[PDB]
């Protein structure tokens, strides 16, 4: 959210909000320099070669998709200057998001969404799940475990393949059982995508449609929304999809988009979501919250240090907006639940963020006219927290001229 201290990649480590860390993942990975920009939120300016064991090298593989779809460059984000620029770019986007009432709400929900402590094998004991923490190096070289909710990290091999991912559990489906897990968003503020808009009467007699660029703040908010769903364990299995086209072809060759993506994008395409399906999940997760409240009630022991069982139950009381009677028992308030659930799944949408940002954005989830551009959001003359690319008091202020790749050409370098 609001990042109080200004960070420079070269700033000296302090073992608190600037330090070398190791991700639970696996392998004795060499620690990487990370920055805590806000409570429960860290930024790691490194290409993500840690989250998935089968995704460790950055070279384009044989058969890689071409330019518009994917983009490779094994050397991107390998120098201190790039990492510094990445850090400042990500920070500026957080401020732009936080500057809207919706973003402030989303960021708050994210900070409160602490991943549940359902690790221990003893149903009567609360224990933090290791993969919901990072290891922070101390002055003597030992490591201290720290819980976090969100990490913004550099992309893997495909530089423009942004996604919100997390570490799985052997048996628990953390993002779909109400528990939640620490989210790692592969993201880059140094590139953006194009789309074609019908800003000319919506009905154009076959003429060169304008070539616009997506505002990175919208792209990041999109992932933070998935992160929110995932932090509260209410994400929808990617296998659940809906058709958006019309008819389909052999081997399920029909235009289908996952439930998760349609609700996240919102707007027009949300109508393709079956209402019965929506209700089924709303109720399913209702019961998940209940089971959590029950586990909190039937809990006695807890593992850790600076955290007491009482202190934690209260932390989860706040996250899941639970009701606490005089006796101390927890229960799920159906009215509170419906409020929180709607917020996370209906209010937090890309469509709504586009309305608060007053920017131009593609109207439909699937983009059939893709383009990729190298950008630089750090210089104030290029992009600001309040106007994005459409700087007020410049010829870029009107008609989304700032996002127009031909009008504001100096800010968008076509990658092909």
Active site residues: 223
DSSP state of 193: E
Closer CB to Zn ion, 211 or 226, in the complex: 226
Using alpha carbons, list the distances in angstroms from residue 314 to 66, 181, 329: 50, 18, 11
Dihedral sign for Cα 91, 94, 96, 99, please: negative
Report the nearest approach of Zn ion to the CB of residue 236 (Å): 11
Closer CB to Zn ion, 85 or 109, in the complex: 109
Is 169 a known ligand-binding residue? no
Closer CB to Zn ion, 117 or 365, in the complex: 365
Residues 367-396 that bind Zn ion (CB under 5 A): none
Q: Among all residues, whose Cβ is closest to Zn ion?
A: 261
Report the nearest approach of Zn ion to the CB of residue 40 (Å): 22
Closer CB to Zn ion, 197 or 261, in the complex: 261
Is 226 a known ligand-binding residue? yes
Report the nearest approach of Zn ion to the CB of residue 226 (Å): 5
Using alpha carbons, list the distances in angstroms from residue 198 to 195, 211, 352, 368, 411: 10, 10, 20, 14, 22
3-state secondary structure of 402: helix
Report the nearest approach of Zn ion to the CB of residue 18 (Å): 30
User: Is the distance from CB of 241 to CB of 256 less than 8 angstroms?
Assistant: yes
Residues 243-272 that bind Zn ion (CB under 5 A): 261
Q: Give the Cα separation of 333 and 347 in Å (integer).
A: 20
Distant-in-sequence, close-in-space partners of 27: CB < 8 Å, separation ≥ 6: 53
Size of the site for Zn ion (CB under 5 A): 1
Strands annotated E in 107-227: 125-126, 133-137, 143-147, 150-154, 163-165, 183-186, 191-197, 210-213
Report the nearest approach of Zn ion to the CB of residue 234 (Å): 15
User: Is the distance from CB of 224 to CB of 237 less than 8 angstroms?
Assistant: no
Distant-in-sequence, close-in-space partners of 28: CB < 8 Å, separation ≥ 6: none
Report residue 97 as tokens.
């998001």
Distant-in-sequence, close-in-space partners of 24: CB < 8 Å, separation ≥ 6: 130, 131, 133, 134, 135, 167
Closer CB to Zn ion, 190 or 261, in the complex: 261
DSSP assignments along 11-72, one per residue? SPP-SSSEEEEE-SSSS-PPPEEEEEEETTEEEEEEE--SS-TT----SPPTTPPPTTT---
Closer CB to Zn ion, 129 or 257, in the complex: 257
User: Is the distance from CB of 88 to CB of 61 less than 8 angstroms?
Assistant: no
Give me the residues that bind Zn ion (CB under 5 A), please: 261
- Residues at the binding site for Zn(2+) are 222, 226, 261
């Amino acid at each position: 959210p609001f990042v109080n201290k200004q960070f420079n990649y070269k700033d000296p480590v302090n073992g608190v909000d600037i330090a070398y860390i190791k991700i639970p993942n696996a392998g004795q990975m060499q620690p990487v320099k990370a920055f805590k920009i806000h409570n429960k939120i860290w930024v790691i300016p490194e290409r993500d070669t840690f989250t998935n064991p089968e995704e460790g090298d950055l070279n384009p593989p044989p058969e890689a998709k071409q330019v518009p779809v994917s983009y490779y460059d094994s050397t991107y984000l390998s120098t201190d200057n790039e990492k510094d620029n990445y850090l400042k770019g990500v920070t500026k986007l957080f401020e732009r998001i936080y500057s809207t009432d919706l973003g402030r709400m989303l960021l708050t929900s994210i900070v409160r969404g602490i991943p549940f402590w359902g690790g221990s094998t003893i149903d009567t004991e609360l224990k933090v799940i290791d993969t919901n923490c990072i290891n922070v190096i101390q002055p003597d070289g030992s490591y201290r475990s720290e819980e976090l909710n969100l990490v913004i990290i550099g992309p893997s091999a495909d530089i423009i393949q942004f996604e919100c991912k997390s570490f799985g559990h052997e048996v628990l489906n953390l993002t779909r059982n109400g528990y939640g897990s620490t989210q790692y968003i592969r993201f880059s503020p140094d590139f953006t995508f194009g789309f074609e808009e019908s800003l000319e009467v919506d009905t154009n007699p076959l003429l060169g449609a304008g070539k616009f660029a997506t505002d990175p703040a919208v792209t990041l908010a999109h992932e933070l929304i998935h992160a929110g769903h995932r932090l509260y364990g209410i994400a929808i299995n990617p296998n659940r999809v809906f058709k958006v086209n019309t008819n389909a072809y052999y081997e399920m060759s029909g235009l289908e988009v996952s439930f998760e993506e349609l609700r996240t994008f919102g707007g027009h395409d949300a109508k393709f979501i079956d209402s019965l399906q929506e209700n089924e999940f709303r109720l399913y997760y209702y019961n998940k919250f209940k089971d959590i409240a029950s586990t909190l009630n039937k809990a006695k022991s807890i593992v850790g240090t600076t955290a007491s069982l009482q202190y934690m139950k209260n932390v989860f009381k706040e996250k899941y907006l639970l009701s606490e009677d005089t006796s101390g028992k927890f229960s799920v308030d159906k009215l509170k639940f419906d409020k929180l659930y709607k917020m996370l799944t209906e209010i937090y949408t890309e469509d709504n963020f586009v309305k608060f940002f007053k920017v131009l954005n593609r109207k439909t989830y699937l983009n059939f006219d893709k383009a990729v551009f190298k950008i630089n959001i750090v210089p104030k003359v290029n992009y600001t927290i309040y106007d994005g690319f459409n700087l007020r008091n410049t010829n870029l202020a009107a008609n989304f001229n700032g996002q127009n790749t031909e009008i504001n050409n100096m800010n968008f370098t076509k990658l092909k």
